[PDB]
Amino acid sequence: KVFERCELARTLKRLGMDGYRGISLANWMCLAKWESGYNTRATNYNAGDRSTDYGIFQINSRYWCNDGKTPGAINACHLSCSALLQDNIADAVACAKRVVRDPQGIRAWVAWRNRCQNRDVRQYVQGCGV
Known part of the structure; x- marks a missing residue:
């Protein structure tokens, strides 16, 4: 499924992501x-x-979900990687929460550092009712 912006924002907000461990919904x-x-x-x-x-x-797949084909991989979210491909994101959210419970927090994702860290993220949640 391809979520629309605000559609995803409220879906994330409903799943308990707004401020989870200090990370805003915009992030x-x-x-x-x-x-x-x-x-x-x-x-x-x-x-x-x-x-x-x-x-x-x-x-x-090396650290968070098991797909059975990643050498010496681990399954920290204790989930089949298949769970991360559902239209329903509750499992993906549980896993992303698990990821951020680690030391780096939201920094775990390099793409966040590249495009989100120290930038204007308001735009992602504007007009969304969150």
Whole structure:
């Protein structure tokens, strides 16, 4: 599924993401925007280390979800990577929360540092009723 901006904002807000561990909803939108264009079916393979990024947040298979084909991979969100490709993002959100419970927080995603960190993210949540 390809979420529309405000459609995703309220969906994230309803799932308990506004300010989760200090991360505003604007930040989460900027991340989803840049990681996948709000696309839940998005997947990017990494031929370099044989891992795959899954979903609207592009969560990597080496650490967060099990796909059975990533060498010495771990499954921190204790989820099949398949769960990250559903139209329903509740599982992806639980996993993204798990990711940010780590030291780096939202910094875990390099794309956030590149396009969201220290930038004007209001635009992502404007007009959305959040």
